[PDB]
Design a protein around this ligand. Structure first.
Ligand SMILES: Nc1nc2c(ncn2[C@@H]2O[C@H](COP(=O)(O)OP(=O)(O)OP(O)(O)=S)[C@@H](O)[C@H]2O)c(=O)[nH]1
Ligand SMILES: [Mg+2]
Lengths: 478, 341
């Protein structure tokens, strides 16, 4: 009776926490019944719209590792709630839709669902507001941080891909360019290009933004209820896991400090050479990428990958972590058996991309994954929104193992080698890779001699780690 | 709301994806559809086809394993003129080039090199265009419809053509079929009505341009087995055009090339009892074309579970009347196939 509209309010709050307001109210007039039959044969359904004249901001906290050093993993999550709540208040001031928030990186768009005639102004003024808010946060909380901002305009095809942990994102080459101009930026200034400056109309303090190492500038200022209940329960188990939902049932916020949890990233390498925008924006290419992400998500419904959590997918990357739910060490279970089953998850998603390429004719997707375990930090960011995410040095080293890997092979760090080798798996010594904070680090690869006669390559000591596409490394290694 | 009308007329159309290997006749079928149901760059790339054909024959003279020599050995300066212009971006086509090309094509060692054209990659409009640019050595001639059908331009990318037969909307996807272009095919697999698969039937003795070690018709068989057993096409029927029937006819009536030397099961093959041959047709040609049809129907019969079908037709893309007949038949077929949802 009245608990039906209670469940409808909860379902409303879980729709709005993952989708923008226009698309959420479109979903709340129950527009497509086939999507409403999907919440209940050739391609899986997906919704994307190739939208022009947007403005994409990224923004990354500079100096996040030392700022999160001596924290008790509740103080960290609390101050991070404070900073990101200030950013959300800036978003709802400046009329820029935020997209998501991964790690120490926050990123927005400027009027992709609704066309806005001054989207570039909204985007760079929101970046200047971020610089102001982070210096006020540094003064108040006494934490020595600032942030660099990059803004690019262009066309963007935006929507939802995947069906576990799905979320409204954006994808284009313009998003990759906004990412790299965040990466090429200086802290404290918003880093804009010619694509923004051609209609920025120069009412700001522009500079020739030159690199130290392409018409780029710098600005510094101036029984129905059973259906509704199961539907809202699926939307809740969508956006956060179960144990965090139980701990958040009796409290106001969530923050947890795990001492041993594994984590994989999984980047599809050659999706760039499949992408080309020559047909209708390339949304058919993202339909194909949706099919592969949905196959990975169908791996999660297996009865033996119940305790594998999926954090999110970042472009073509796929982040998953384990050992978060296993609070009780059983009587007849190995203490690091979650590492064994997350490694089996990585092996089986290798198998899934092998089975996927049989239906792909005269092209092969390849993915590299990277594996690590250790202590980490779980938490929930928003209130009136929700965002489950993990942090730690372990996640940064796993992103490093993804980025510094060879394709079609599982790269495994040294302590993960030392625990996996006692469970019978065979590895071969890849070499020694520079890891920030660790220095030169001993790495390993999983398939024994899957190349003909070249297992070792230990010469890699590259300092310039600049990624030209959206990967799992964003929000990692400030 | 204006999107319900557009959504329903999008439901009303027929998406006709054209697949197949390279040089099989897809773009010629698209050109034939716009002849049936719908200006100097055509002259230019017809001249490019002429130049490409004559230089390919002239180079393949020496590049054969017995080098076929000139029947008149006095044209060696003309051979050297053709080999001199073998690689140049722009070419104004002077009348000297037309005289050298005609004096090549009158020579009979040149034609004896032309007859062994399955041992090197040569285009399927040489014999027509050598005579027809003997016709248009001058400049004030507009090409005919057959001249436009015979021109070969390599398709790369997804091309679309909307035409409307008797108040029914058609929207067909011309795609390139070279091996590096095939990754672009899956962009068209969503909500397509039928697949028109086009096979160069007469290319049983030829090899593909990519590696020069794989038979063209074996490549088409492997490609058909790929797109038939696909996970996103497993409810979509495949109309199977078998193109280039006149070329298959003249290559069987020539008697030089033997299908049993390349596909060895042809010698113990008998023509089917339900064969419907054309008026006045040599049954060795009929045995050949039904052999190729049953080679593809073996693939379409071995799996498919009754979810999707295969409807083989015999067709010649440069003949407009043949395309009118087979497209009326396919029009009734895809009317049924669109009603099948
Ligand atoms: N004699 C004859 N020639 C044909 C026939 N169909 C096509 N051709 C010739 O084959 C050549 C190539 O045909 P084309 O239509 O370009 O194949 P395609 O599929 O588009 O080639 P691609 O796009 O995969 S590279 C053209 O020169 C054309 O004249 C036919 O039915 N009979
Ligand atoms: Mg073509």
């Amino acid at each position: 009776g009245k608990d039906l509209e209670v469940e409808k309010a909860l379902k409303e709050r879980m729709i709005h926490s993952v989708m923008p307001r226009i698309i959420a109210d479109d979903l709340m007039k129950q527009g497509d019944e086939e999507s409403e039959n999907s919440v209940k044969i050739a391609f899986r359904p997906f919704k994307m719209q190739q939208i022009e004249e947007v403005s994409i901001l990224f923004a990354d906290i500079v100096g996040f590792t030392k700022m999160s050093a001596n924290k008790s993993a509740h103080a960290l999550v609390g101050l991070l709630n404070d900073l990101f709540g200030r950013f959300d208040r800036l978003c709802e001031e400046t009329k820029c839709e935020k997209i998501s928030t991964l790690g120490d990186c926050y990123y927005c768009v400027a009027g992709c669902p609704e066309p806005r005639a001054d989207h570039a102004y909204c985007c760079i003024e929101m970046g200047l507001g971020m610089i102001r808010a982070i210096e006020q946060f540094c003064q108040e909380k006494k934490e020595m941080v600032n942030m660099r901002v990059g803004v690019h305009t262009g066309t963007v095809l935006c929507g939802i891909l995947g069906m576990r942990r799905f979320k409204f994102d954006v994808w284009s080459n313009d998003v990759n360019l906004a990412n790299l101009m965040e990466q090429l930026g200086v802290a404290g200034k918003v880093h804009i290009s010619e694509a923004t400056a051609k209609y920025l109309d120069d009412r700001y303090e522009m500079e020739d933004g030159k690199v130290t190492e392409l018409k780029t500038y710098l600005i510094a200022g101036q029984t129905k209820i059973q259906s509704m209940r199961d539907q809202a329960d699926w939307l809740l188990r969508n956006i956060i896991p179960y144990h965090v939902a139980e701990q958040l049932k009796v409290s106001q916020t969530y923050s947890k400090n795990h001492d041993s949890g594994g984590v994989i990233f999984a980047s599809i390498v050659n999706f760039s050479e499949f992408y080309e925008e020559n047909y209708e924006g390339g949304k058919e290419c993202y339909r194909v990428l949706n099919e592969l992400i949905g196959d990975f998500d169908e791996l999660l419904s297996k009865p033996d990958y119940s305790s594998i959590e999926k954090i999110k997918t970042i472009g073509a990357t796929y982040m998953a972590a384990s050992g978060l739910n296993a609070t009780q060490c059983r009587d007849g279970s190995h203490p690091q058996e979650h590492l064994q089953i997350l490694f089996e998850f990585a092996k089986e998603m290798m198998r899934v991309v092998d089975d996927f390429n049989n239906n792909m004719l005269w092209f092969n997707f390849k993915l590299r994954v990277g594996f690590n375990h250790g202590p980490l930090t779980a938490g929930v960011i928003g209130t009136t929104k929700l965002l489950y995410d993990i942090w730690g040095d372990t996640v940064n080293i796993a992103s490093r193992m993804d980025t510094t890997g060879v394709e079609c092979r599982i790269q495994v760090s040294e302590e993960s080698y030392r625990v996996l080798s006692k469970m019978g798996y065979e590895f071969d010594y890849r070499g020694t890779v520079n890891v920030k904070g660790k220095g030169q680090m001993k790495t390993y690869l999983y398939p024994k001699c899957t190349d003909s006669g070249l297992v070792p390559q230990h010469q890699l000591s590259i300092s310039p780690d600049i990624r030209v596409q959206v990967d799992g490394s964003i929000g990692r290694s400030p | 709301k204006q999107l319900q009308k557009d959504k329903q007329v999008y439901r009303a159309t027929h998406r006709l994806l054209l697949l197949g290997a390279g040089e099989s006749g897809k773009s010629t079928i698209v050109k034939q559809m716009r002849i049936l149901h719908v200006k100097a760059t055509k002259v230019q790339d017809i001249k490019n086809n002429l130049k490409e054909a004559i230089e390919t024959i002239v180079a393949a003279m020496s590049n054969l394993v017995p080098p076929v020599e000139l029947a008149n050995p006095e044209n060696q300066f003309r051979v050297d003129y053709i080999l001199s212009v073998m690689n140049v971006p722009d070419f104004d086509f002077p009348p000297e080039f037309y005289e050298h090309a005609k004096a090549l094509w009158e020579d009979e060692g040149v034609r004896a090199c032309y007859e062994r054209s399955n041992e090197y990659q040569l285009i399927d409009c040489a014999q027509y265009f050598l005579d027809k640019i003997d016709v248009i050595k001058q400049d004030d001639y507009v090409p005919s419809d057959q001249d436009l059908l015979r021109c070969r331009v390599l398709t790369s990318g997804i091309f679309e053509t909307k035409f409307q037969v008797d108040k029914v909307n058609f929207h067909m996807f011309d795609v390139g079929g070279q091996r590096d272009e095939r990754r672009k095919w899956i962009q068209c697999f969503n909500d397509v009505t039928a697949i028109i698969f086009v096979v160069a039937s007469s290319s049983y003795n030829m090899v593909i341009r990519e590696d020069n070690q794989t038979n063209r018709l074996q490549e088409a068989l492997n490609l058909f087995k790929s797109i038939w057993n696909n996970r996103w096409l497993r409810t979509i029927s495949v109309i199977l055009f078998l193109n280039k029937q006149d070329l298959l006819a003249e290559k069987v009536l020539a008697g030089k090339s033997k299908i049993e030397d390349y596909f060895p099961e042809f010698a113990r093959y008998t023509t089917p009892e339900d064969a419907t041959p054309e008026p006045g047709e040599d049954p060795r040609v009929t045995r050949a074309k039904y052999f190729i049809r049953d080679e593809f129907l073996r693939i379409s019969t071995a799996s498919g579970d009754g979810r999707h079908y295969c409807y083989p037709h015999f067709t010649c893309a440069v003949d407009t009347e043949n395309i009118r007949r087979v497209f009326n038949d396919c029009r009734d077929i895809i009317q049924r196939m669109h009603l099948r949802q």
